[PDB]
Amino acid sequence: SMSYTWTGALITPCAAEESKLPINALSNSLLRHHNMVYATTSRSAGLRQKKVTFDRLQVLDDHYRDVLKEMKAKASTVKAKLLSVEEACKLTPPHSAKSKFGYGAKDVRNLSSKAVNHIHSVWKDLLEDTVTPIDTTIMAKNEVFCVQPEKGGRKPARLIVFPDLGVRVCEKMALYDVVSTLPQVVMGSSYGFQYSPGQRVEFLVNTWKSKKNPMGFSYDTRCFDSTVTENDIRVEESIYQCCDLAPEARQAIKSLTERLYIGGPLTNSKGQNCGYRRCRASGVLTTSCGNTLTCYLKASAACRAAKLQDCTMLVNGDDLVVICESAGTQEDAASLRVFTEAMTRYSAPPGDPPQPEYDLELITSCSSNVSVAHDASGKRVYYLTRDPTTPLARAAWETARHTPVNSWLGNIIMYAPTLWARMILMTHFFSILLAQEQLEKALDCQIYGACYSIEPLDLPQIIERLHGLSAFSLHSYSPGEINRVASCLRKLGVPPLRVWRHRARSVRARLLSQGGRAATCGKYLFNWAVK
Amino acid sequence: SMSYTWTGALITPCAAEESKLPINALSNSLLRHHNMVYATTSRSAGLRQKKVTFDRLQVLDDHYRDVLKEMKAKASTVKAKLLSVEEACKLTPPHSAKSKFGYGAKDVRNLSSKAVNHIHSVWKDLLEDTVTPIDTTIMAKNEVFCVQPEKGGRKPARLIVFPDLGVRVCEKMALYDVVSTLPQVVMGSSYGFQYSPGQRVEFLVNTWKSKKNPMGFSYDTRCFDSTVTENDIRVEESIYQCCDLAPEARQAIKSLTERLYIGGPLTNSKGQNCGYRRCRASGVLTTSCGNTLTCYLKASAACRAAKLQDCTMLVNGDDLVVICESAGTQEDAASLRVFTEAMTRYSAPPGDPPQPEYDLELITSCSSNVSVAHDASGKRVYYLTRDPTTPLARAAWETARHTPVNSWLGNIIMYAPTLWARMILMTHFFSILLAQEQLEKALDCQIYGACYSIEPLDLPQIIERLHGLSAFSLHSYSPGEINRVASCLRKLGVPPLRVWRHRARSVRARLLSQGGRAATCGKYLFNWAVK
């Protein structure tokens, strides 16, 4: 069936949408080619609709059926509980879209009688009505990227589909305990979300070294959410039901699947009907768990169809990495094509055909890759890095415009061990915090699904806990990583690394001069700039 | 061993402590005998210390051992999970004591890097150190009561013992999932906290009617927290460990039991050492679950020792109700004494010897009792009520002084079906909200462990959901209930019910005149005042 059927009404914004990077001195201090940085807007919604709309054909086989039976068997060992209205309220993110019914996320979090009474009513309706399609809003996302001249130039806006806040809180009551425990049990070490950056690296490196002659590849599905079929969604529901659940939870899960997860009507910010969805909604509670389980099921089956040897998989939504025993150059190439044809039959064709890789550093998944450097004693240390283009573009954007979110702070924490986060992001932002004497002001930072209130002076402790002390002394990075960073700087018109090392020496001196916590940051975060 | 050993340092306050009800016109509008209303203060801490300090002797027998084996068997069917630091933070109550380490409940709730980093450090310490006694603060509670001339007059302040906020958040990571699920599984229908007031009544009435010749009694232990021994606390820990837990959870539960739950040093608000505890701390996460499990184990054993027939128990902490088949007047009296001697051997002697009752309305537990009235069709309706003295005294106190908590609102909701909440509390407070045009201002209300933000206009929907529509039309209350309310009014110098019915007619007219939501409250909340 068609992933979407549209009416013609447009996907409308609900606030101003900025698309250009504003010429700023501070921002130009970091990046000079401002014209290359842009943000998506509802203006390009049409192009996206075109890409995400297509008929899905799916043919399953015994490889698929076998893996699904194996997953259900593991699922049957899971026990999950219903969250109460109050627990679900307390776990609701602070900045989510307010309800059309007169209350917002803050009212939910504060257990307002208005929010609470309405949520009890939505819950009772879910249990008593298991058929009426539930309303969802469709919006264009506003995200920042760097232009890609080697093609479409600017990317069209991504689309987000979500139900009302009341329903979202009810999804948590029914499924929060399930989505936070089931994936790990079913998939084991292949469940990517259980790992911090260093643990992810550890799993990949140990897996890689365990093969006599390792071969690996990344796979990513073109418009994965659109490739998810009704049968895939019902299969997910059948997996949830294998768990030992409370009766109301079972009833609510079934109702949510029928009325919301399998599909339903799309409404724009104007209240007009935009169309109908027959695929994965990107803004529901089960989006991540569902996508990961489905990608894992199809990829596991595909590995069997392609007869890949001693496969080990790592899955984060539609992002897949498979490491296996090489069967030879031409044999591997042919096996990957068979793998891809199986994934295609199961409905998940790739954006770009996967390619066999014999160098772990060259495999990119979740927009990241493993790389190596050396610690103080000269020992090899593996860590997670990524191309710095998007992180840099977003940093310049946040430098030029106060943003409710500090993605740059999130990158500093997740990528603390990398050459670019240390030399460029840390130097750039601490220089700014010093100049504005806001070194002690807490900033909101979205990381791993949660919004934290982080005081910059806490960074050394945060990084130490997440990456370990060696994060402050890595040196001798790989040529491939150094060249990628250098090229990216040239492309974006950001000062070469020589300049950053010089600027970092100054920031460090300024931090030490203050003593206390500030000096601690100078000592640890910028020990690399010394001598 | 001794429940407490003291040093001599005093239990000190950390803010002003008011003990007298302030002569106020509005408050005197509700109650005239202001001199009878008082609040406890640290001044009487010494008297309490005396009462809660004593040697505990405990002799267990096969009845006890048998019940414990049965509980462990049910416990073994429970699976519980560790909460992450973030989940535990989000579930931390908004007004809990700030940490000595530089952050408070709001910082915890907002996932401040300061709170989060410290909590990770406390967690790591719990796992790596399983012996060092953890610090706790001891404070006198400030609560409002009505004088009891027939004895001690004024009651001494209760004492609360609690660890630092960081530790409290770690208790949730290790045990939140356990304390919210285990009691119900082990105890079934006897676990009192699973019931709303009406469900509690339903369970008691159906149990009562199921006996050929019902006999029942309430039991309450004198200073229960003090009667809990080290063996009782270790037995609780052994029950928790029967659950299918994560390795870190098991380690943290063991460490918390050794370093905190079994006992430890007491520090006052001044930082001075007040003494040492060898019994239940009143302010830990496991206080309620632990007390309920322990009371259930001792009472179950005691029922067997006393050979009570077809016993059915309801347990809320140390508050116990037992309903059984009468064996005759003198037989029941003798069996209750044997029951009490068994409870005493197990270490839990009663405040007042329990007495057999053959009238369900006369059994009071959790300061409450079942009573009957009639709905619109004249059908008998059972509901939960209580002596209105404390609720009234607190209402007058909150009328005279703005309070962070609106216990009166909590009583209106929990006791909506009662004659006194409807005729006195609702009338009194809506009259005030009207006069101050604050009918739409939300008030903080502590109910069932959570703090809600309630808009008065939401009361009809709240009451309907909790008690059902019949709550707005009950009439023909029992003589015993009517006389108790009438006597209490005489004792406190509050206007007789005739006056309230008259005052309610006025409030109702004023509400109807406004239309909308206000008129709804007039129609439902005060339909009893009509004609």
Ligand SMILES: O=c1ccn([C@@H]2O[C@H](COP(=O)(O)OP(=O)(O)OP(=O)(O)O)[C@@H](O)[C@H]2O)c(=O)[nH]1
């Ligand atoms: O239009 C879109 C596409 C994707 N997403 C969301 O992006 C997340 C995946 O993040 P990825 O970084 O894996 O995106 P992707 O490009 O592979 O996504 P697809 O186009 O293949 O679906 C998922 O949580 C998905 O719901 C949107 O919110 N909107």
Ligand SMILES: O=c1ccn([C@@H]2O[C@H](COP(=O)(O)OP(=O)(O)OP(=O)(O)O)[C@@H](O)[C@H]2O)c(=O)[nH]1
């Ligand atoms: O000094 C005290 C006594 C009791 N409590 C707390 O009161 C709650 C029980 O509430 P109850 O209403 O059952 O108190 P009680 O008088 O039976 O208490 P005991 O003296 O027998 O212990 C329990 O949660 C207990 O920790 C205090 O906080 N301080």
Ligand SMILES: [Mn+2]
């Ligand atoms: Mn994709």
Ligand SMILES: [Mn+2]
């Ligand atoms: Mn993409």
Ligand SMILES: [Mn+2]
């Ligand atoms: Mn992807």
Ligand SMILES: [Mn+2]
């Ligand atoms: Mn991405």
Ligand SMILES: [Mn+2]
């Ligand atoms: Mn991407």
Ligand SMILES: [Mn+2]
């Ligand atoms: Mn007691």
Ligand SMILES: [Mn+2]
């Ligand atoms: Mn008492």
Ligand SMILES: [Mn+2]
């Ligand atoms: Mn009690």
Ligand SMILES: [Mn+2]
């Ligand atoms: Mn009480």
Ligand SMILES: [Mn+2]
């Ligand atoms: Mn009491």
